[PDB]
Design a protein around this nucleic acid. Structure first.
Lengths: 128, 93, 98, 109, 85, 109, 95, 128, 83, 98
DNA sequence: ATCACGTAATATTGGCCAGCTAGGATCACAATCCCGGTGCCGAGGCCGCTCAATTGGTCGTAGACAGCTCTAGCACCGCTTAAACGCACGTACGGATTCCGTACGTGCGTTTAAGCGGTGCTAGAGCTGTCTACGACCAATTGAGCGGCCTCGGCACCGGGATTGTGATCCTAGCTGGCCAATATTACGTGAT
DNA sequence: ATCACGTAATATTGGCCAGCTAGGATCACAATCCCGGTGCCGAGGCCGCTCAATTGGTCGTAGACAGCTCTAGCACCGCTTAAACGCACGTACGGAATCCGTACGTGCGTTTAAGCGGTGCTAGAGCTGTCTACGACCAATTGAGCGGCCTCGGCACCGGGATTGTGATCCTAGCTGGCCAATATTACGTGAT
């Protein structure tokens, strides 16, 4: 019954309660063609693209500039991220895909699956 | 008429635990209420135990059980130890 | 072909297990649990049937009231699903200091 | 020829009063009869708890470089100890305030 | 005669916790609720059974009775009727 | 030389046992001494509370078309009364179950 | 041989037949009501004892019971309990 | 101390935890000029237009159908609602206002304050 | 005479202070009346129990020990007032 | 010239009224309130100063703990601000109901 | 040899028909409900007994009551000043909306172990009798405890200096808006038909 | 005379220039911390004196202990499903992102009444003394309550119909995509440089 020692002092446990991933290639703001298109384009269009790029829409203010800062996708062809972007692209209306091609200087003439492939190759390596 | 309290005993314990330290009247009233509260809790549990077992007597065993029930954890253990030691000493003399 | 939309069965189960009073934990496992716990306080123990049944009634009422408070906390958070944070909050408030 | 009298406290090695505790137990109407070791054991328990609180409170007071104990120091000791805060949970201490505890989410970032 | 009974908390199964919740008015339940509830229950049971076994040893019994459990809960501030409260 | 026995409960117009309550008060070590009107008062209070509970529980049973009270009926009577549910708020009834209470926000629209 | 235990069962039966003559009660419910009676008895008697101690009085009388009732039982419950208790004490003193 | 009735049982208090306002004018869907624009347009430019007509932006699917049924603004020139729309127009970027003019067949050649006035007059009475 | 409308003496800034001592940063405007009601309830109960203990002591004066017993009853034991 | 952004002075006041122990309600208003309440239970009453001081200490401690639980409920609702619903929830879980 | 132009093969785009999705109404399936018959077992009644309740008398003391003191609660005034109040203003917060993914809910087939009933053993609850050690009680003792009084030191507060921190201001870089000049569109004059 | 088309005025848009805004860095000021110094008032000690603690003895009885009865707990077994588990799948939910409106925080100037001290009065707390009604206690008596037994009433459960809530399916309606026809682009042969 007699504990020969000091008592341990316990403590009460109280109930406590925009990273641009830089990819491979060139920024969409440096590429003369794309930069000229964004200048001619508007905040509206980049709402769908900012969703496609960073999986979230963007502030009417920090939208066009952040999309221009997009320098590529740091992941490679066949990654889980590549497949997840390809499905997103397949889920976009053909008119949207044609608008995204026009913002990236890609040819708007083509089948849905080709517009998807040509946008997805460009978003890996944005080339002037 | 003279009123009772636990003050001098708390001052003795303190001097044994902190000979450099003192205590204010208000703190002493708090310690007196604490002593009286603990006393009432333990004695109530001891009486209740005796009644549950149909005993008319309160002994060190009842107090030790009431301590086990009320005081929590290592506190209970070190209180049982200090009470067993004190009862042993008292019985030796 | 018939399948119920999520929620409908849950509400039916709610109406049912509130209309009822039987114990909801199985008795054998709860008994084994009681004995397991008691082994850490004293060995070679024995339990009356009424004692185990009392522990069971008490633990079910306790968990039921806890889940009531937890559902209240959840709803407070504009949710419908209860989460561990809700339980921790209900306990921290009831004075159990979770 | 009468032997010198030493108090029940001395015989038990305590600072708390054993006679006073035996009287309160007798005058507290807890039981018809009261053993001899009951007040001794009980006084020793009270002495132990008092000493535990005074250790913690004196530590807290030394932390604030204060030599005298005041209610705030008792509150700090009690609430900062888990077992004491457990036993003294519903207990309210006048002029003892509360523990500094600001929830993180309220802090600025 | 004597055998250790380990991993008996898991006998408080997912559907049983689900039933208890339903009796508490719960509609949707996370997946972590189950372990949180098992821990909560193990704590409650530890305290109640500690107090009951204490009352028992005090009574010089080796068997835990219903009166021990009732006194223990009554102590925890959770009075229980139907067992002689 | 001895009058016909007339029990205290009969002298008070009650059903509960006054003699038994006297005995329990004396054997509970509640007080060294117990007045004559204390057990009478206490038995009358217990009888009133019992009658209240049973009135409400029998009403509940009749609402479920039952002639025989069971624990669920007691739980209903208690939790549906403001005073009883306050008196017995920290109380648990065996096989009492719960009061049907689905929060509105869970019901569909 | 001889085994004796006490309860309040028959008195609860009597109260029931006073308020609900054509109604009955089960054994489990009767045990619950017995526990309720014992609980409220312990509560009232404990409050009465503490009252007598606070006032340094050695006796428990109708006053201490009345105060303990008014303190423990809530609201109209307390008023009606006091009424019943006073009526019973009155009838008892008129022996 | 003695009462005269029965207990008044006290009831326990348990703690209990797209309207198109039609305005004055022709629906933007019945105006073949504007309707041909929306057909040539995508859910982005209409998204800007809706963040303007009903305060809160709509859903990709609803956005379209909702802008289709704008029957005009039911309030008059000088109302608190007119002033509150005029400020929301002054707070739009001049490229947005030019995109809204192009969705309403309004001339995209004017000073900010004129683009605001010409859109606001059209949104009171959408005329073919 | 008779005191009236004295609940309002528990003023907005006093409730604000209490909250701050409780760790509160932002406060609605309805919190003030809710708190006044909560406090009036708490006091009704505590003072009922205290006045009861008083009449039972045949006193016309409320003491601190009466208040201490009342709080102990509400389950809110208080130290430093003769407990 | 200088103006603190909302929430700063609030944290400062928090640290202040937590470092301290002085009663935060003014005395005379509390005393008048106490007498008002009591006058509904018995007339021509008298209060010791210690009794009023005890009631004040008790009320402040009660409201402070209530506001702790309320701030916890609020935070649980992803809200910095406390609202009456938070108080009602805290009390319903505490057992004070209402 | 390279390049401009007309022709032919290849490719793109507008219109149309068809496919797909939305909303409302209709219909079938399942759950909930009710309603009568059955047996089953626990509720409720009866009875002998015993032990706990009642009665009547004696006695001591706990507490009601009266009287005095004096402590302390109440009331009241005036001054100071910090707190409360009221209002203006704007930031940060709460609420609403949308969207997206995936975590739960639901259904199904398989597994597993709870539940029930039955047998055997046995530890330990429960009761009784013996008796001793222990506690209660009283008388004399006495010394610890406590109220009154004095006196220094811990502390709470003031002023000065210093440090940490927050809010505001300033500078640098990028984007947006307006203005001006170049170029496309429209109306009139002129050449061809 | 009508139509087609060169040229000039008008209109639209790209380049240039300027203004605006967001982010980062810097500074000014203002709250917090440190350090003495100091007057104070409450802790801490001292003293004598009362009543609670103590020593000693004796005596009744609480409960420790042994012994016996027998209840109830435990271990084991074997079926028999009902529940649990694993898994597939899809939808409602939670979370995150965005935005807007305004409620609450902050600060200033004005008003209020809290606080503090001092003064005067008197209710009632607290104590003492008294005397007595009332509760404890004992012994004898006795009837209500407890346990055992029995025997039917309440209820659960089931099977057969009725109603209702939920989900799936069908119908009418709107929007978008693949296919087809018309037309633009590009490769190639021929002519010119």
């Amino acid at each position: 019954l007699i504990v020969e020692g000091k008592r341990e002092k316990k403590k009460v446990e109280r109930l406590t309660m925009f990273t641009i991933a830089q990819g491979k290639g060139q920024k969409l703001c440096e590429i003369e063609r794309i930069h000229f298109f964004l200048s001619k384009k508007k905040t509206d269009e980049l709402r769908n693209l900012h969703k496609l790029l960073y999986n979230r829409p963007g502030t009417v203010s920090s939208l066009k500039k952040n999309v221009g800062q997009f320098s590529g996708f740091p992941f490679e062809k066949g990654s889980v991220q590549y497949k997840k972007k390809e499905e997103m692209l397949k889920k976009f209306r053909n008119a949207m895909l044609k608008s995204i091609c026009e913002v990236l200087d890609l040819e708007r003439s083509g089948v849905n699956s080709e517009l998807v492939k040509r946008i997805l190759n460009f978003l890996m390596h944005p080339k002037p | 008429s003279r009123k009772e309290s636990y003050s001098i005993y708390v001052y003795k314990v303190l001097k044994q635990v902190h000979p450099d330290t003192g205590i204010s009247s208000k703190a002493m009233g708090i310690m007196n209420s604490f002593v009286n509260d603990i006393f009432e809790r333990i004695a109530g549990e001891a009486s209740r135990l005796a009644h549950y077992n149909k005993r008319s007597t309160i002994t060190s065993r009842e107090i030790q059980t009431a301590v086990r029930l009320l005081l929590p954890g290592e506190l209970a253990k070190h209180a049982v130890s200090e009470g067993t030691k004190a009862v042993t000493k008292y019985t030796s003399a | 072909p018939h399948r119920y939309r999520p929620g409908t069965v849950a509400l039916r189960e709610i109406r049912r297990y509130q209309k009822s009073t039987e114990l909801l934990i199985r008795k054998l496992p709860f008994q084994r649990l009681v004995r397991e716990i008691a082994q850490d306080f004293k060995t070679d123990l024995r339990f009356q049937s009424s004692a185990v049944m009392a522990l069971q009634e008490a633990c079910e009422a306790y968990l039921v009231g806890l889940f009531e408070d937890t559902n209240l906390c959840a709803i407070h958070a504009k949710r419908v699903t209860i989460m561990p944070k809700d339980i921790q909050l209900a306990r921290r408030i009831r004075g159990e200091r979770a | 020829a009468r032997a010198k009298a030493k108090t029940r406290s001395s015989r038990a090695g305590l600072q708390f009063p054993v006679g006073r505790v035996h009287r309160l137990l007798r005058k507290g109407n807890y039981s018809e009869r009261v053993g001899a070791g009951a007040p001794v054991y009980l006084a020793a328990v009270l002495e132990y708890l008092t000493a535990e609180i005074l250790e913690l409170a004196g530590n807290a007071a030394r932390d604030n470089k204060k030599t005298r104990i005041i209610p705030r120091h008792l509150q700090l000791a009690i609430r900062n100890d888990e077992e004491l805060n457990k036993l003294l949970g519903r207990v309210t201490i006048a002029q003892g305030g509360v523990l500094p505890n600001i929830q993180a989410v309220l802090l600025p970032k | 005669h004597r055998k250790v009974l380990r991993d008996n908390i898991q006998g408080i199964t997912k559907p049983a916790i689900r039933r208890l919740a339903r009796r508490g008015g719960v509609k949707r339940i996370s997946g972590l609720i189950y372990e949180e509830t098992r821990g909560v229950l193990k704590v409650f049971l530890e305290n109640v059974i500690r107090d009951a076994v204490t009352y028992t040893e005090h009574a010089k019994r080796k068997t835990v009775t219903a009166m021990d459990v009732v006194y223990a809960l009554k102590r925890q501030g959770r009075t229980l009727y139907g067992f002689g409260g």
